[PDB]
Structure formats: structure tokens, C-alpha cells
């Protein structure tokens, strides 16, 4: 039941903070994906780093507007809160060793 | 140079053909068991390609354990309500980039 992801692109909105009692450090990874003249598509992925230690090092080493390579697992969060009547999913790319990790190229 | 690449392996479910805004797709579900705690995830797999989708819809049967090899996309979408903005997480599969493969034994 292998789940896997690899991403490369610009970093944005880097933040620390906790998930439900869990030190996290997420950020957006915008990816350009030229769909099959004359338009291109982008894809902002919520990269969510767990493991307070890895969470910390990531938090420090990763700068804004960077270009990093993200290995990790793709997760789906049921979310769906009040304010409306419908269930949607949260597409966050979970990164926490010994799962994946984040290298930096810019 | 951006890189959006996913890989999957798990159980398939609710397989059906149709169109994505007038596009011959064969959407279905792949369930990776991302693991006492057994955490599951049900991924949507939208296989575009007039021929490709048909290809897939026939060799691919429910229960089959297959691999998925494609982009991680997410349609914005603006439901009747409400102000809450939500994205639709699926997996765009389409040759020569996408790739599907059933497992036997």
C-alpha cells in the first residue's frame, strides 16, 4: 500500500504552530504544470512537516520564495466544518521522517 | 522547473466512466493503507484520454490492487455555499506521464 510524493517549486506562507497537540511547520509549494497554446496551470500544495525536531530544522532552514524538493506521503483530511452543510477533504502533503524530507535548491 | 509526481498502490473502488467538463475520463478510487493504528486514505484517480480512459475502464476491475503514477491536482470549485473556499484533491492520470498497472497473483 505504497503512498509517495515528490515536489519541486516555490515556497510560500511558512508557519510553525501545532496540529491538535503536535508541533507542525507547514508551507505552500506552488508547482507549474503545463497542461496537455496557450495557457499554464499552477498547483499550491500544503506541505506539512511533523516531528518537532525535523519540524524545527525545517522551520529554520527553509526560506520564503525558495525552491525545495519535497519527498513525502499524500494525506487527505476529512475537515468539513460548520458554516455550511457539506464534506470536503484537505489535501496536505505530510512530511515527517523516517518518511520523507525536504532538500533545498534555492 | 516544477515537479509534481505522485505514486500509489492499493485497493480500487467505485469505478465509473463519464466526462470532466466534456472530457472522456474514467475516475475511480485508490486506497493506500498509510499505516496499533491503521490509517487509510481514499484517493480519487481521474484518468483522462479519449482512448486511455476506455483502456483503463476495461482492464481495471474493482478490488484490483493497482499502481497509480500521475500528477497531484486540485480543482478549486465554488459550491452553492458558502464563503469557505475548498479545493478538490484528485490525481490527474494521462499518458505518457500518467500510468496505471494492475497486480495479479
Amino acid at each position, epitope marked *: 500500500s505504497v503512498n509517495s510524493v515528490t515536489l519541486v517549486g516555490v515556497v510560500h506562507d511558512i508557519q510553525s504552530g501545532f*496540529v*491538535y*497537540e503536535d508541533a507542525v*511547520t507547514q508551507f505552500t509549494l506552488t508547482t507549474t504544470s503545463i497542461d496537455t497554446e496557450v495557457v499554464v496551470e499552477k498547483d499550491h500544495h500544503t506541505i506539512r512537516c511533523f516531528g518537532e525536531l525535523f519540524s524545527a530544522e525545517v522551520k529554520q532552514k527553509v526560506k520564503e520564495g525558495n525552491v525545495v524538493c519535497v519527498n513525502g506521503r499524500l494525506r487527505l483530511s476529512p*475537515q*468539513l*466544518e460548520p458554516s*455550511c452543510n457539506k*464534506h470536503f477533504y484537505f489535501p496536505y502533503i505530510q512530511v515527517q521522517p523516517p518518511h520523507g524530507q525536504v532538500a533545498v535548491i534555492h | 522547473k516544477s515537479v509534481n509526481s505522485v505514486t500509489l498502490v492499493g485497493v480500487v473502488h467505485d469505478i465509473q466512466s463519464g466526462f470532466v467538463y466534456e472530457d472522456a475520463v474514467t475516475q475511480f478510487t485508490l486506497t493506500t493503507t498509510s499505516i496499533v493504528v491503521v*490509517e487509510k486514505d481514499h484517493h480519487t484517480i481521474r484518468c483522462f484520454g479519449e482512448l486511455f480512459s476506455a483502456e483503463v475502464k476495461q482492464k481495471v476491475k474493482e478490488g484490483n490492487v493497482v499502481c497509480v503514477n500521475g500528477r497531484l491536482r486540485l480543482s478549486p470549485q465554488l459550491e452553492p455555499s458558502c464563503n469557505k473556499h475548498f479545493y478538490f484533491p484528485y490525481i490527474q492520470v494521462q499518458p505518457p506521464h500518467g500510468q496505471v498497472a494492475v497486480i495479479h497473483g
Partner: nanobody
Framework: VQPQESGGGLAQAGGSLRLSCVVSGITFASEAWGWYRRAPGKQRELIAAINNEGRTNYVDSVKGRFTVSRDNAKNVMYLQMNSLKPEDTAVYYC???????????????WGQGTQVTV
């Protein structure tokens, strides 16, 4: 706000019972909450979330079944459970869902929880 689940134990398949949750102790209202039940070896599953006013949503599996309500003056989560299937049998927790996406906030902490068996 240090969570505190309460109420629960055992009831017939079809029996009923209500749960509870308290926190010490601020700030309610501003924060929307919910209830999370967990199977023996399975992951926690959020059941129903109550809005900041608050409106409410439920799980596709529990729609038209469970009923959740909240009180601000006493900071209490109320979960009146009726006619309980052995499926509902799980460790129920109560905590604050939020952000519906842009999560990561404060420190957060999990309550001990309450038992539900039918």
C-alpha cells in the same frame, strides 16, 4: 483550556446516553469545537462540529442520528446519543476543530477521553 471529557459507559444496542466536555477555561465562543471517537486500533474520527455561533455539521454515517450542542457561559460540549449501534462503540474525545485548512494554532492538547460501549 485543558480538556475534560465525561459521561459514558454502557448501554443496550438501541439504548441511549449523553456525553460532556469542559475546559479551563478561555476562550469559548471564538473557538469552534467537536467530538472525536476512536476505534480500538483505528484512528480518531471527528463526529460533529459546532460553529462559533454556532451552526453544526455531522458525519455521513451519523447524519439524522446524533445531536451536538454547546454552552458558552459554562464551556460545555453536549452530545445526546440515542439508539446506539455497536458501531458507535469507541473512545469518544472532545476538542476544538478549526481553520478547515489553515490549521496550526497555539499549543493544543488532547483530553483523556470517555468510553462508549454498546
Amino acid at each position: 483550556v485543558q480538556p475534560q471529557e465525561s459521561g459514558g459507559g454502557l448501554a443496550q444496542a438501541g439504548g441511549s446516553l449523553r456525553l460532556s466536555c469542559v475546559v479551563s477555561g478561555i476562550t469559548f465562543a471564538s473557538e469552534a469545537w467537536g467530538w472525536y471517537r476512536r476505534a480500538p486500533g483505528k484512528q480518531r474520527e471527528l463526529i460533529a462540529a459546532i460553529n462559533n455561533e454556532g451552526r453544526t455539521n455531522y458525519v455521513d454515517s451519523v447524519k439524522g442520528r446524533f445531536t451536538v450542542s454547546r454552552d458558552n457561559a459554562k464551556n460545555v460540549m453536549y452530545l445526546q446519543m440515542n439508539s446506539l449501534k455497536p458501531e458507535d462503540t469507541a473512545v469518544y474525545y472532545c476538542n476544538a476543530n478549526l481553520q478547515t485548512g489553515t490549521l496550526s494554532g497555539a499549543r493544543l492538547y488532547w483530553g483523556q477521553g470517555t468510553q462508549v460501549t454498546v
